[PDB]
Design a protein around this ligand. Structure first.
Ligand SMILES: Nc1nc2c(c(=O)[nH]1)N[C@H]1C(S)=C(S)[C@@H](COP(=O)(O)O)O[C@H]1N2
Ligand SMILES: Nc1nc2c(c(=O)[nH]1)N[C@H]1C(S)=C(S)[C@@H](COP(=O)(O)O)O[C@H]1N2
Ligand SMILES: [Mo]
Ligand SMILES: [Mo]
Lengths: 373, 373
């Protein structure tokens, strides 16, 4: 009996890197076509079989401050708390892992530039759910909100992750228990019926198929939170790694990639429209994207599309374009790099940011194309 | 009559880049000797003559919500609000400007690696001063707290800067109206009797010789806030610059430099202790410093000294060291790079981050030395 037999069907055009469990990204030519990634193209990252959930018997378990347990149905989650909408980009820590393997092979799913997508999410504020359970605005010291998914190891251990309590309770942090995605109910692959969405934070923490929410003095003790998605020095390998030396990724650094044109393409002479995305963690706005055609020697400023968000709440990626003249029979190396609102920047090369897990791959994206005659 | 005749005397050992107005950094061999920079060595950045202030007639003007003005004496500032202490690093946007001129000359003071220092500051919380003036915890929309110094242009325009209202009112942001520095009253060069200290934010906003605090729907309209300390694309020069296209620097990106040994030094064979500082903006902790001896090809992890701060409140730099073996008659190129709590990193080279103002210089610091026989 195959544990994945009950997995949902998917859109045919996806770049699949794993069938069981299912991991896929949209083609790069469609990735940044729209500001909001259609649900069918939104990248999918699963560690386990997809839970099959009967909507009416579903209960979200929320542990209260004193040890008691609140049990919430989907209907109650919909009706008791004012629905809030947050447009937010999820990026996997493993995004662009494949460029890291080009330096030296790494463990992990070989993501290209598409382990990132954007949706308008709708649901209960996590803040409101915790206050209803009885928690105060503020706990003394460093507390965490731990989540468990309905998906578990063969031995019983569920997918688990956590965020700091401060972020959970913050109105401005926009943390949702989402049951809607781009205006329709959550797809199975994306957490039906309920997922956490943590804006400005690595995808790992946005726990799908939510079964439990608990408040703890410690972060999630799940092996996913303890052993994955941490960043190490380039000198560290599997025989020397000590998971305690690096913190769980929460906010991600500034990131950008070229979606148009594609590597190895032949483009017509005259004008070329270069397109891509840019994004940064922690609600930090993209203030600028620089684009080079000559391998990063000279730069021009891209046009940033779409609308400004409030300060500290730039949860959604900025899409960018730049139309440039191109000469017949030349070689272009197209490079992009982004600058965020704290003026963080992307580093020149991959090797100095290499790590055994292939996470945190934010060096300049480089695309080599030729111009036709 | 010389406008600077009344300026305070300074410690003899400083690397002075401007006498009038006075701008100087501590020697690099003393810069990171102590976690807390002695007041006499703390870097000094003045745009103007230093105000001469009679303590007893000094009044801080605070505009209230409705148009009225609260006037505070130094004694009242000391007695009415509970003294709070914040250890915080100030870094000038112009820090390491000189490395940028090596690519292509820039305007600005030619700072080396020392336009940064750390002190334990003591004073009134700005939060408490604003609440006492009558302001609420929260204003609707994007509001700013504008500061003016006692120092002014020959034409009358005072040094001015601002921070967002949200940061001013936040308990955790630790914004002070400081009258103490490393346990003694504020030195004249450092803002006597009162300065703003804005932790995790560029030095520009920590307004010295404070005369006025006002709340505004707009940021400071001073030419310093509008025309300086903004970051542009490397393609921008003085004939194309449009100050409206880049935001005033608030939080700074991750930064680090080698203080020991010094460029061109001859060091003994056997063991070499490399020392430096690392720091990041926005209360983001330094989670790691990587050190290279071979120009950034291979890296080792430094020891981070000193104590952990609360999450999101790492206002003070991390000092680091690494003892390595060195072979007689070899050349070393010593490189350091830091990683912060959002996993932001420093870029490889200066040219791609070059800008006409020479600000935001955070590429890897490189120090070339030789090992004796
Ligand atoms: N229950 C559960 N939640 C989960 C995962 C999972 O395997 N199980 N994967 C996580 C990781 S690592 C990522 S990157 C995001 C991806 O979400 P998406 O599939 O909606 O893009 O979901 C996170 N939430
Ligand atoms: N009134 C006033 N405040 C000021 C300045 C100034 O010229 N006048 N310089 C600013 C800048 S650009 C910097 S980097 C810091 C430096 O503070 P320090 O001299 O205590 O290091 O002060 C800031 N506050
Ligand atoms: Mo992920
Ligand atoms: Mo400055």
């Amino acid at each position: 009996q195959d544990p994945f037999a009950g997995d949902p069907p998917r859109h045919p055009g996806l770049r699949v890197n794993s069938q069981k469990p299912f991991n896929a990204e949209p083609p790069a030519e469609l990735l940044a076509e729209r500001f909001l990634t259609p649900n069918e193209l939104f990248f999918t990252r699963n560690h386990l079989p997809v839970p099959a959930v009967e909507p009416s018997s579903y209960r979200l378990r929320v542990d209260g401050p004193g040890g008691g347990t609140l049990s919430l149905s989907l209907a109650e989650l919909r009706s008791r708390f004012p629905k809030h909408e947050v447009t937010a980009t999820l990026q996997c820590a493993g995004n662009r892992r494949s460029e890291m393997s080009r330096v030296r092979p790494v463990k992990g799913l070989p993501w290209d530039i598409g382990a990132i997508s954007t949706a308008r999410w709708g649901g209960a504020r996590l803040r409101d759910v915790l206050l209803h359970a009885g928690f105060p605005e503020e706990l003394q010291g460093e507390w965490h909100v731990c989540f468990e998914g309905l998906d578990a190891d063969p031995g019983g251990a569920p997918y688990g992750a956590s965020i700091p309590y401060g972020r959970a309770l913050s109105p401005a942090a926009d943390v949702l228990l989402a049951y809607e995605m781009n205006g329709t109910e959550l797809p199975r692959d994306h957490g039906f019926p309920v997922r956490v969405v943590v804006p400005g934070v690595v995808g790992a923490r946005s726990v799908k198929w939510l079964r439990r929410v608990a408040v703890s003095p410690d972060e999630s003790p799940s092996h996913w939170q303890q052993n994955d998605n941490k960043g190490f020095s380039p000198c560290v390998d599997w025989d020397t790694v000590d998971y305690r030396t690096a913190p769980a990724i929460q906010e991600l650094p500034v990131q950008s990639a070229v979606t148009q044109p594609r590597p190895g393409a032949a483009v017509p002479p005259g004008e070329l429209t270069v397109k891509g995305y840019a994004w940064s963690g922690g609600g930090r706005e993209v203030v600028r994207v620089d684009v080079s055609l000559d391998g990063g020697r000279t730069w021009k400023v891209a046009r940033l599309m779409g609308d400004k968000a409030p300060p500290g709440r730039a949860w959604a990626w900025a899409l960018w374009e730049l139309t440039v003249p191109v000469e017949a029979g030349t070689e272009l190396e197209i490079v992009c790099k982004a600058v965020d609102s704290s003026y963080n920047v992307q580093p020149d090369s991959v090797a100095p940011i290499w790590n055994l897990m292939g996470v945190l791959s934010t060096a300049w994206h480089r695309v080599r194309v030729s111009v036709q005659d």
